[PDB]
Short mmCIF file of C-alpha atoms and ligand atoms in Angstrom, two decimals:
data_model
loop_
_atom_site.label_atom_id
_atom_site.label_comp_id
_atom_site.label_asym_id
_atom_site.label_seq_id
_atom_site.Cartn_x
_atom_site.Cartn_y
_atom_site.Cartn_z
CA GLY A 1 0.25 83.91 166.31
CA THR A 2 1.40 80.30 167.09
CA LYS A 3 -0.02 80.27 170.70
CA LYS A 4 -3.72 79.59 170.37
CA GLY A 5 -4.88 75.99 170.72
CA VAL A 6 -7.63 73.98 172.35
CA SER A 7 -8.33 70.74 174.05
CA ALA A 8 -10.80 68.63 172.08
CA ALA A 9 -12.64 65.35 171.75
CA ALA A 10 -14.11 63.81 168.58
CA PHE A 11 -17.66 65.25 168.72
CA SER A 12 -19.69 65.64 165.56
CA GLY A 13 -18.23 68.74 163.73
CA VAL A 14 -14.81 68.72 165.51
CA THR A 15 -12.75 69.02 162.29
CA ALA A 16 -14.82 72.05 161.15
CA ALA A 17 -14.80 73.60 164.71
CA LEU A 18 -10.97 73.29 164.96
CA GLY A 19 -10.50 75.05 161.65
CA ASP A 20 -13.26 77.65 162.30
CA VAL A 21 -11.75 78.72 165.64
CA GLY A 22 -8.27 78.97 164.19
CA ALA A 23 -6.61 76.48 166.53
CA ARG A 24 -2.91 76.23 165.69
CA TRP A 25 -2.59 73.14 167.90
CA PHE A 26 -4.75 70.81 169.94
CA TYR A 27 -4.52 67.95 172.37
CA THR A 28 -6.88 65.21 173.55
CA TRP A 29 -5.43 64.10 176.92
CA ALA A 30 -4.23 60.97 175.06
CA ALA A 31 -1.27 59.68 173.06
CA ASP A 32 -3.19 60.07 169.74
CA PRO A 33 -5.99 62.29 168.35
CA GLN A 34 -8.80 60.09 169.80
CA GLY A 35 -10.61 59.93 166.43
CA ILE A 36 -10.15 63.58 165.50
CA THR A 37 -9.11 64.39 161.95
CA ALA A 38 -7.18 67.67 162.33
CA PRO A 39 -7.48 70.38 159.71
CA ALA A 40 -4.37 71.26 157.77
CA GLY A 41 -2.08 73.46 159.89
CA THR A 42 -3.46 72.29 163.28
CA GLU A 43 -0.71 70.43 165.20
CA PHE A 44 -1.59 67.53 167.50
CA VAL A 45 0.32 67.37 170.80
CA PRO A 46 0.31 63.91 172.44
CA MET A 47 -0.04 63.37 176.19
CA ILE A 48 1.01 60.57 178.53
CA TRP A 49 -1.94 61.04 180.91
CA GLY A 50 -0.96 58.76 183.80
CA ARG A 51 0.96 55.71 184.95
CA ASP A 52 -0.97 53.30 182.62
CA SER A 53 0.27 55.22 179.49
CA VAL A 54 3.97 54.71 180.37
CA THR A 55 4.47 51.77 178.02
CA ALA A 56 6.86 51.31 175.08
CA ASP A 57 3.79 51.00 172.80
CA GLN A 58 2.16 54.27 173.99
CA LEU A 59 5.43 56.18 173.91
CA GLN A 60 6.13 55.01 170.32
CA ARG A 61 2.57 55.97 169.34
CA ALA A 62 2.94 59.42 170.86
CA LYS A 63 6.25 59.97 169.03
CA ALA A 64 4.66 58.91 165.74
CA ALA A 65 1.70 61.29 166.34
CA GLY A 66 3.59 64.48 167.16
CA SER A 67 6.74 66.33 168.07
CA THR A 68 6.05 67.64 171.59
CA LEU A 69 4.99 65.48 174.51
CA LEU A 70 2.86 66.48 177.53
CA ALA A 71 3.31 64.47 180.71
CA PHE A 72 0.80 63.45 183.38
CA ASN A 73 -2.51 65.26 183.88
CA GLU A 74 -3.15 66.65 187.38
CA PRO A 75 -1.07 64.06 189.25
CA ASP A 76 -1.73 66.14 192.40
CA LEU A 77 -5.47 65.15 192.36
CA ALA A 78 -6.91 61.79 193.40
CA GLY A 79 -9.55 61.98 190.60
CA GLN A 80 -6.90 62.57 187.86
CA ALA A 81 -3.47 61.03 187.37
CA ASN A 82 -3.24 60.57 191.18
CA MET A 83 0.55 60.10 191.27
CA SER A 84 3.24 60.93 193.79
CA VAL A 85 6.21 63.02 192.76
CA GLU A 86 8.40 59.96 193.42
CA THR A 87 6.36 57.87 190.97
CA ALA A 88 6.42 60.60 188.32
CA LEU A 89 10.19 60.98 188.64
CA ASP A 90 10.73 57.21 188.51
CA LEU A 91 8.67 56.99 185.27
CA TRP A 92 10.25 60.16 183.78
CA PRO A 93 13.20 58.48 182.05
CA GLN A 94 10.80 56.60 179.75
CA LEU A 95 9.18 59.86 178.60
CA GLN A 96 12.56 61.58 178.34
CA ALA A 97 13.93 58.70 176.24
CA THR A 98 11.46 59.55 173.42
CA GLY A 99 13.68 62.56 172.72
CA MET A 100 10.64 64.81 172.22
CA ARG A 101 10.35 68.31 173.62
CA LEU A 102 8.83 67.41 176.99
CA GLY A 103 6.37 69.19 179.24
CA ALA A 104 6.19 68.68 182.98
CA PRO A 105 3.15 67.04 184.50
CA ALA A 106 0.36 69.66 184.59
CA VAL A 107 -0.57 70.23 188.23
CA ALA A 108 -4.12 71.31 189.06
CA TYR A 109 -2.92 73.64 191.86
CA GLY A 110 0.06 75.06 193.67
CA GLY A 111 2.59 75.29 190.87
CA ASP A 112 4.35 78.25 192.59
CA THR A 113 4.08 76.87 196.16
CA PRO A 114 7.36 75.85 197.85
CA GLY A 115 7.16 72.15 198.72
CA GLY A 116 4.10 71.62 196.53
CA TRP A 117 3.83 68.90 193.90
CA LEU A 118 5.40 70.84 191.01
CA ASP A 119 8.16 72.28 193.18
CA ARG A 120 9.15 68.82 194.50
CA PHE A 121 9.00 67.41 190.94
CA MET A 122 11.17 70.16 189.48
CA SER A 123 13.65 69.94 192.39
CA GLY A 124 13.92 66.15 192.03
CA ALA A 125 14.26 66.38 188.26
CA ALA A 126 17.16 68.85 188.70
CA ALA A 127 18.82 66.59 191.30
CA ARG A 128 18.56 63.59 188.96
CA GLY A 129 19.83 65.52 185.90
CA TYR A 130 16.53 65.08 184.04
CA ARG A 131 15.26 67.27 181.22
CA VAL A 132 12.02 69.23 181.60
CA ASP A 133 11.66 71.55 178.62
CA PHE A 134 8.47 73.48 179.52
CA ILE A 135 5.78 73.61 182.21
CA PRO A 136 2.11 73.24 181.36
CA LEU A 137 -0.35 74.70 183.87
CA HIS A 138 -4.08 74.59 184.62
CA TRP A 139 -6.04 77.52 186.00
CA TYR A 140 -9.77 77.95 186.69
CA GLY A 141 -10.80 81.34 188.06
CA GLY A 142 -13.59 81.67 190.60
CA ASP A 143 -13.67 85.46 190.42
CA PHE A 144 -15.75 86.19 187.30
CA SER A 145 -14.90 89.92 187.12
CA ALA A 146 -12.52 91.79 184.84
CA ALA A 147 -9.86 91.13 187.54
CA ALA A 148 -9.67 87.45 186.49
CA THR A 149 -7.11 88.04 183.70
CA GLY A 150 -4.62 89.61 186.09
CA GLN A 151 -5.11 86.78 188.58
CA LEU A 152 -4.33 84.22 185.88
CA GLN A 153 -1.35 86.30 184.76
CA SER A 154 0.06 86.45 188.30
CA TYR A 155 -0.04 82.63 188.60
CA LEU A 156 1.71 82.12 185.25
CA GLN A 157 4.31 84.74 186.12
CA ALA A 158 4.94 83.16 189.56
CA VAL A 159 5.56 79.74 188.03
CA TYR A 160 7.86 81.23 185.34
CA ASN A 161 9.78 83.13 188.05
CA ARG A 162 10.23 80.00 190.16
CA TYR A 163 11.49 77.48 187.54
CA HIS A 164 12.36 79.57 184.44
CA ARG A 165 10.81 77.11 182.01
CA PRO A 166 8.54 78.38 179.24
CA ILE A 167 4.87 78.10 180.18
CA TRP A 168 1.96 76.46 178.42
CA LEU A 169 -1.56 77.02 179.74
CA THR A 170 -3.11 73.66 178.77
CA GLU A 171 -6.47 74.16 180.54
CA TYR A 172 -8.09 77.39 181.56
CA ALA A 173 -11.55 78.91 181.97
CA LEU A 174 -13.67 80.72 184.52
CA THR A 175 -14.98 78.00 186.83
CA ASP A 176 -15.32 77.98 190.62
CA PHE A 177 -14.48 74.45 191.82
CA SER A 178 -14.40 75.61 195.67
CA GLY A 179 -17.93 74.16 196.06
CA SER A 180 -19.66 70.67 195.99
CA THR A 181 -20.52 71.28 192.32
CA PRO A 182 -18.87 73.56 189.77
CA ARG A 183 -20.11 77.22 189.45
CA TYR A 184 -19.95 78.99 186.10
CA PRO A 185 -19.96 82.60 184.84
CA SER A 186 -22.67 84.15 182.72
CA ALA A 187 -22.20 83.83 178.97
CA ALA A 188 -21.22 87.53 178.76
CA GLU A 189 -18.72 87.20 181.61
CA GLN A 190 -17.17 84.22 179.91
CA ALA A 191 -16.87 85.93 176.51
CA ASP A 192 -15.36 89.04 178.07
CA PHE A 193 -12.80 86.86 179.86
CA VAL A 194 -11.96 85.04 176.62
CA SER A 195 -11.15 88.38 174.98
CA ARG A 196 -9.18 89.86 177.87
CA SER A 197 -7.28 86.68 178.73
CA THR A 198 -6.20 85.89 175.15
CA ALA A 199 -4.96 89.48 174.68
CA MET A 200 -2.91 89.08 177.89
CA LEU A 201 -1.55 85.66 176.94
CA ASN A 202 -0.58 86.88 173.47
CA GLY A 203 1.60 89.58 175.14
CA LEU A 204 3.58 87.35 177.62
CA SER A 205 6.74 86.19 175.90
CA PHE A 206 7.20 83.35 178.40
CA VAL A 207 3.79 81.85 177.54
CA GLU A 208 4.30 79.78 174.40
CA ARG A 209 0.86 78.18 174.05
CA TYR A 210 -2.60 78.28 175.60
CA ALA A 211 -5.71 76.13 175.34
CA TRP A 212 -9.18 77.13 176.58
CA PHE A 213 -11.04 74.31 178.36
CA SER A 214 -12.63 73.22 176.03
CA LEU A 215 -13.63 73.25 172.38
CA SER A 216 -17.07 71.63 172.78
CA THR A 217 -20.05 71.99 175.10
CA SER A 218 -20.20 68.14 174.85
CA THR A 219 -17.03 68.22 177.09
CA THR A 220 -17.94 71.04 179.47
CA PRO A 221 -20.41 73.89 180.05
CA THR A 222 -17.48 76.26 179.28
CA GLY A 223 -17.26 74.87 175.73
CA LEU A 224 -16.71 77.26 172.84
CA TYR A 225 -18.81 75.40 170.19
CA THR A 226 -21.86 73.23 170.04
CA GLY A 227 -21.25 71.14 166.99
CA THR A 228 -19.95 73.51 164.29
CA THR A 229 -21.64 76.61 165.80
CA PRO A 230 -19.56 78.92 168.03
CA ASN A 231 -21.23 80.64 170.97
CA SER A 232 -20.17 84.15 171.97
CA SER A 233 -17.11 82.67 173.70
CA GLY A 234 -16.17 80.70 170.60
CA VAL A 235 -16.57 83.89 168.55
CA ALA A 236 -14.22 85.71 170.96
CA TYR A 237 -11.67 82.86 170.86
CA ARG A 238 -11.85 82.77 167.05
CA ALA A 239 -11.10 86.52 167.02
CA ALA A 240 -8.04 86.10 169.29
CA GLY A 241 -4.52 85.98 167.77
NA1 NA B 301 7.53 62.64 166.21
#
């Protein structure tokens, strides 16, 4: 398959972990690999994370580093890119002018909601004659049962049905963020979800790429690897197509 990728940072053993897990692509939330040496066959995808990365220098660096460009990360959240739709649209021509295959900003929430951030962005892009080649999404499930895969699927399908752009899933895991501090599944629940979700994602033609959040436990408790050693979730992700 071409779909399976990961987000990553340059922790000790990252090059080995990327190859071990079989990542076809990766990204780093930045315009370059952030110190990661990718294994052969693992494609880096640059990102323009927020307003401060919309510079001629960053855009040229991104275009030198890869072929596909991801736009702003969670502009809908104050603790992430924290950007209005208007600001994102006004910056958009600079990203579009790279000529790269271009992903929408990845909203944290509400991608299928009429009048939400993504909907207003896509509507304004269409009105302005802008190009948006694909839509990357984020999804963190708070229901840790076998039902989680179908919940994720329904969100992806809703966003595809609304805008008819191919979908990337650039962050996903089981994590309940409803509370003052994140709540996580058991290791077994997580590994089962990795298996079921990747099988689902591999069968949806409109999902081009997906990336578990994240490769390393140094990034998040939902990490797949500690150093070069996969946990049961990393083993399940490695086994996925
Ligand atoms: Na390029």
